[PDB]
Amino acid sequence: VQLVESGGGLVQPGGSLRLSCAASGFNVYSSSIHWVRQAPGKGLEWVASISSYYGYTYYADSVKGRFTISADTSKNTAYLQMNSLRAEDTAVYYCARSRQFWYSGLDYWGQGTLVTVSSDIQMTQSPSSLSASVGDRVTITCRASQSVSSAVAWYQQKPGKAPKLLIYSASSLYSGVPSRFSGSRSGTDFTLTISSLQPEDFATYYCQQYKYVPVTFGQGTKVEI
């Protein structure tokens, strides 16, 4: 019911890398595979995604056509073949799964493969950082440049671990997440609230839109004590 991700490692500039990502217990024709980059101490960045049902290949603006793809459905595996890595490719890449029918955010994420080498909707987050204790009311707002239809899912990323979503479409919370989490929609500005800041809840939150391809993450808000 999890997904595995491998193939990443140290690659010299201009090299190639066939990152392997496989899902166990997931039919490929009902689950799409998505790939999001992350630089050192920066925001997330979606690079490409593949849906096997329609045979469509969506590319990011930065690596449009420069990143090879190869996937199969018999082995339930999608391979990420790199080609001519640039200086911006020194980033940890996360294979992820979202429901290939009626998209509801990247639900199941991989452990993330860390590699090193040696109009566009730009949602903005506010505040960029926060510090609070247990029980303090905390509200984090993400502002989108162009209005969407509440097609934003909120994520909680702690230090190092795989980021996971809690509420999809900014309205309905996912199963397995405590009811103390919620979200709201206000025009093009998107906010979520938390009642009690538990020690597990003290983690960095990320927002991202998926109404218009390519998807784009927020700015990244760090929660401190």
Added chain:
Amino acid sequence: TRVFKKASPNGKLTVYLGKRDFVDHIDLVDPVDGVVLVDPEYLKERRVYVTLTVAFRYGREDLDVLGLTFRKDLFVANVQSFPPAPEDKKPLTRLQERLIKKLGEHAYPFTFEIPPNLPSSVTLQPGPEDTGKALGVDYEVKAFVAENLEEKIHKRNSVRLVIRKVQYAPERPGPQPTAETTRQFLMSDKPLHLEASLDKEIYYHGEPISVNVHVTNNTNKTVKKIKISVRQYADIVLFNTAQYKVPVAMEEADDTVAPSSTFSKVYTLTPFLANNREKRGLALDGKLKHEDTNLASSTLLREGANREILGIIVSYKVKVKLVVSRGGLLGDLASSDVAVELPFTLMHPKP
């Protein structure tokens, strides 16, 4: 929360709709509801009407004709919105109440009522050559203002909006689909049994179909290949009963079985649209304007009602075949085959 708006090019009347889609269960279908807000300054005498048409396009995407228009309507229901039908009471829902509470008193509501035995919104695949509107049954809601019911609906002062009606699979699955037929040749009276069965009755879009098969080759003959195919029978019923037999996915099993032998193993199938794009005549479940969608989810039908009053019905039955050889004193590799069918239901879940 969020309500859809079309905001007509006239800029005066705007249609407000709750949900773009509409779930239709086995017996009851979710009614449609909404409001329209029209600047009352212009509407001195002209009356604003809204309607829902179950269209049926069959003549490809060819150019329009003088009066042919290559179309057909299955169910058309119009109502009066300006004024808000004082003769007939409107049981407005909570969504309508909140929606005209948000707007002013000049906003006017509307509501329809889909009858049960109607086809789900399924559009035929346009194919490569066709450029324009797609075929297949389609739901459309349009709002216009016109003092006369037969007056021309000028697109410059009107609006339209696309609706799809979808069915969701039952929570309780049906019986396990099993069917075993037998037949022999004139050489001997030793028929062979094709034990064929499935895993469940309801399958999800992309869920792997797992056909269970078991052969008993008691007949003194060999089986060259086993034809496993999941097909889509689209009973296009408008003036006739042209049941199509387009195979959505198929596979071949080269598991030869000796005479007086038995063999059984489960094969896996997956219906999907990635490789079936070019195949014209495939039925696609719903289209807003041109966005890609899945294969047509199988339409649920209730026994006891007439099945010959529906536009397009899509039903899936996985067919298992085995091919044998008629070699001997006078024969060649060419021979006949026997087919036994296995119905199953392929639809979305109910979230």
Added chain:
Amino acid sequence: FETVVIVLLTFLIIAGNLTVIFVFHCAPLLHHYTTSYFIQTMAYADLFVGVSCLVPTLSLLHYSTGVHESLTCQVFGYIISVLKSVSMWCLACISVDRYLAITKPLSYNQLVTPCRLRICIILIWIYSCLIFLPSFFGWGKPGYHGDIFEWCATSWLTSAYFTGFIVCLLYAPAAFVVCFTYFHIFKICRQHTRRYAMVLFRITSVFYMLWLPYIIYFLLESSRVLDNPTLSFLTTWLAISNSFCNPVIYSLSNSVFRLGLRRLSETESATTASSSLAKD
């Protein structure tokens, strides 16, 4: 002056044939497919009748070769008789396929397939070509279709041992198939306790009613009892006029053509946005 009547018949036949084939192609509904392949091939054969009857008649009227042009008359008569034969036998095969609809609908889909009907169409065309090849071999006149030219009118005549043979392999079995099917269908048309029925009965009637004079003349003239060229011309062109009638009556009977052309005879969109609905 009868050539004016015959070119009017050619014009009507050709117009009907393109009308039906264009109706079928522009709206590919494949109406109850099994009896849609048969209607399509009937329309194709009737179009070929129109083409191969307009070409030689126009060639004769516009210019005179002045030589013994027996070959063109022979090939015209043979090909037009083959097309008439495939028309009649395809109507009979429509009826015999319908006999598999009322009785055993469960085995209808288990016996009737597009490949099977393609094989049947190849078989009927081959059978018509084979039955009419001995006519061009030299046994006798295939018929009075090529009675316009004098060479096929007086120089080469029919055979007594040919008319009965043609009837016994094509005409009598086609009548037998129609009698077997339609009588039983009319017997069980109603439940003891659909839309195609009237239109197909009309098609078969407006075929065989005008076809009957041709066959009774074919049988009678071979008996050398009454043979006048004018009446032979009249009966063969009355038989040919079924080509001009069948697409016309089919269009006037099928709902897509009749209702589709009835309206013809009588005769910057904004983006889907949204807003915000406050809850309770």
